[PDB]
Design a protein around this ligand. Structure first.
Ligand SMILES: NC(=O)c1ccc[n+]([C@@H]2O[C@H](COP(=O)([O-])OP(=O)(O)OC[C@H]3O[C@@H](n4cnc5c(N)ncnc54)[C@H](O)[C@@H]3O)[C@@H](O)[C@H]2O)c1
Ligand SMILES: NC(=O)c1ccc[n+]([C@@H]2O[C@H](COP(=O)([O-])OP(=O)(O)OC[C@H]3O[C@@H](n4cnc5c(N)ncnc54)[C@H](O)[C@@H]3O)[C@@H](O)[C@H]2O)c1
Ligand SMILES: O=c1ccn([C@@H]2O[C@H](COP(=O)(O)OP(=O)(O)O[C@H]3O[C@H](CO)[C@@H](O)[C@H](O)[C@H]3O)[C@@H](O)[C@H]2O)c(=O)[nH]1
Ligand SMILES: O=c1ccn([C@@H]2O[C@H](COP(=O)(O)OP(=O)(O)O[C@H]3O[C@H](CO)[C@@H](O)[C@H](O)[C@H]3O)[C@@H](O)[C@H]2O)c(=O)[nH]1
Lengths: 392, 392
């Protein structure tokens, strides 16, 4: 074999997924413009883990396993490039990870908010048109986000909700309430994809994924050149990974505001398993499936406590600090999100464990010398965003 | 005064609104790149009514009344131009009509679908950033669309719905189900604006307007150079206006599919009244108001019957025809949309009448010689849309 095009395959979730699918005997290609690497240079950021070039990564996988992952380097907003890549590779499934995914990045200034929405929304439209024109039976596996739902006072469902209003009943798309220009772009993508499923018969699965944690997967650990990236800065780093690096270097854990912000989380090992399950059990023609892709819910305060306890077993004397919240969001809220569809399809989750935290903390300790502590604290305000292009 | 910037003020709703606000003693400017006129040239379309240039329109208003409407000609996706215009004029309210508004146009080909979403979504983001940066208390009056809601099996509310789910209650944004790339772009705009109201304290009113009919308003009838446009082609023309022109030239009324498609409608005289009411009674800081802006619901079959009856009084022997539907939409559906907010603020509606139809039909008869009958039938298919840029 089945052929899979992994858009955004040089990135954190995409690289792990591309190797996993190749190991599982799918024919794989990666489509990526490598702009994520340019943003690191522009903002003065760097991965905790040293990573190899995409060309060296692919060459190493071939040297170890004999399998060749094809590479197409270009911007999916350039339709000529996307169309040529689709016609060259002929995918049966497309996994779309190729978007600007950082909420803080989308809030840096007007230019970055506009870039986020243009890049994300137009790139996704181009993918839909390429599938329609060149391979209409191709299944689109799209990375959405649990952030599309916001934090309502009712249970969050997997994409749809059956409502009885004024004596009539209907099943409708779940109301969306995004809290950054990045999260909004995903809501726009999901609405666009749903329309094309109905109008054109597209088959698609929206994976509304929770926050991912971890750096190791079976394939990326096979050789140092296959190593994945691990972000810890305040722009691309996410909560748990950030807390583990902070603990390792002796920085107090950065709890934003009250710390009651609750979200779904999952191990990167489960990201790759879930994508494979969605590919192996495809949506039907005209169907827009929505899966809430996470394994456990945690508040920021709960994460801080877990990291503190794991850190104590390693002699790190972890401390916590309250950072005035750079974001506009609820710091105490109801949260009960449903997640059963992937489990019904066979997901065997790796729940957060003492073993995982010990391994991740030891990993951060091993590379603590590479950590730029100046990038730990957040400097991007949701309220103070302006129009001048900022230089960090 | 009070200062109002009318983005899209050379267009059908915008020109009528700009003159009305100027007559009502607001200081007005028009911001428009005139691209709508370019699309007419590119597609081979023309207004039923001959219209003057925007410069001659403004000069005539000044010659008649002594009032000067300021003009800024540029693309609001060019932030330097938008920012300079905002700083020059200093608006207290911004009315945003400046978007690609045709559903068929958005479905012509990939390039037009992408242009629609980029132009509309990025232009609106630029307006939000200009308000935040240069005049944070400025009230945004945005034209959304009744099409954002689609045709659910439950009553349609004015933007929000209170739901009880699994024993908890909350008031949430109403689920959106758009049916063209144009309608989707409005859903994206509404979600973006709602976020900025919460994050930045923006004051905004989304006017989800129904289909507009008519060509005359008090101000545009004061001199021939002030005349508004009246579209009848299958790309920019809308149902009632199209049926009146068809009746006048002897073309059978073009009912798409079964004809049970039901929508809200309103007279252009009410469009201008509603915008003025929203400006005179502004949203509060941080509030995202949503008004369903229409006065009556009609199915396409009902419109066809009304035009046939009015046409009989003028000796036109109106016929009807069933056209295989170019669109993907429900042709028989429940429809009960709420519309009380504008009435509570004082709206005095001009309900569809025998008098209005007689006047509109007589108007079409007066200019029947200008009608290009080759543009009456639809040639844009929702299902057959492709990637090659089409020449019409
Ligand atoms: N990291 C997480 O915690 C997390 C959690 C939930 C969902 N996801 C989702 O998974 C996806 C991937 O996230 P990630 O953390 O791997 O991001 P990443 O930034 O590491 O990877 C994205 C990749 O896409 C590429 N890309 C971006 N725009 C492109 C374009 N126009 N053309 C071609 N390539 C382009 C980038 O160069 C990069 O290699 C995103 O949709 C993200 O929202 C990630
Ligand atoms: N016509 C209707 O029946 C109807 C019904 C409901 C809602 N509306 C809404 O009202 C608004 C105006 O509709 P209309 O019928 O007057 O359209 P129109 O096409 O006659 O007017 C739009 C105007 O906006 C200008 N414009 C477009 N993109 C621009 C840009 N990037 N920069 C500057 N100017 C730009 C165009 O040149 C044009 O003069 C739209 O939001 C539309 O969806 C119209
Ligand atoms: O040091 C930190 C970092 C984050 N937070 C809070 O933790 C929550 C999660 O934030 P973060 O881990 O930064 O994730 P998101 O910004 O939600 O984004 C990530 O997780 C989303 C899951 O929906 C994906 O959509 C995005 O692409 C991905 O970047 C938020 O309430 C933050 O304010 C803290 O309190 N302290
Ligand atoms: O000759 C015709 C034209 C239209 N229709 C049907 O009538 C309905 C209304 O279509 P139309 O009048 O073309 O309006 P919309 O495409 O809905 O768009 C207009 O009205 C919307 C109101 O929401 C605005 O958002 C848009 O900007 C504006 O172009 C639809 O079901 C059409 O398929 C026919 O049956 N015959």
């Amino acid at each position: 074999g089945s052929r899979v095009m992994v858009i955004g395959g040089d990135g954190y979730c995409g690289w792990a997924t591309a190797l996993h699918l190749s190991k599982k005997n799918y024919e794989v290609c990666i489509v990526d413009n490598l702009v994520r690497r340019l943003f690191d240079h522009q903002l003065g950021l760097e991965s905790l883990t040293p990573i190899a070039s995409i060309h060296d990564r692919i060459s190493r996988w071939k040297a170890l396993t004999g399998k060749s992952i094809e590479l197409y380097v270009g911007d999916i907003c350039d339709f000529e490039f996307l169309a040529e890549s689709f016609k060259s590779f002929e995918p049966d499934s497309v996994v779309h990870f190729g978007e600007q995914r950082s909420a803080p990045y989308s809030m840096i200034d007007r230019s970055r908010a506009v870039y986020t929405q243009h890049n994300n929304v137009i790139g996704t439209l181009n993918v839909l048109f390429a599938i329609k024109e060149f391979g209409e039976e191709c299944h689109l596996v799209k990375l959405g986000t649990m952030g599309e739902y916001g934090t309502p006072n009712i249970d969050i469902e997997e994409g749809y909700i059956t409502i009885t209003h004024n004596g009539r009943t209907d099943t409708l798309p779940y109301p969306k309430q995004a809290s950054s220009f990045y999260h909004l772009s995903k809501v726009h993508d999901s609405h666009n994809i749903a329309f094309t499923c109905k109008a054109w018969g597209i088959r698609a699965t929206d994976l509304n994924q929770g926050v991912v944690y971890g750096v190791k997967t079976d394939e990326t650990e096979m050789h140092e050149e296959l190593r994945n990236r691990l972000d810890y800065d305040a722009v691309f780093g996410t909560a748990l990974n950030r807390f583990c690096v902070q603990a390792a270097v002796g920085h107090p854990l950065t709890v934003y505001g009250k710390g009651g912000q609750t979200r779904g989380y999952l191990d990167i090992r489960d990201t790759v398993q879930c994508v494979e399950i969605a590919i192996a059990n495809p949506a039907k023609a005209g169907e827009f499936r929505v899966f809430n892709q996470f394994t456990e819910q945690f508040s920021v305060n709960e994460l801080a406590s877990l990291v503190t306890k794991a850190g104590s077993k390693l002699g790190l004397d972890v401390k916590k600090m309250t950072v005035p919240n750079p974001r506009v969001e609820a710091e105490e809220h109801y949260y009960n999100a449903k997640h059963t569809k992937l489990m019904e399809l066979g997901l065997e989750p790796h729940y957060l464990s003492d073993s995982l935290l010990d391994s991740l903390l030891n990993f951060a300790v091993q590379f603590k010398d590479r950590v730029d502590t100046k990038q730990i604290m957040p400097s991007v305000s949701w309220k103070k965003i302006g129009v001048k292009t900022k230089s960090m």
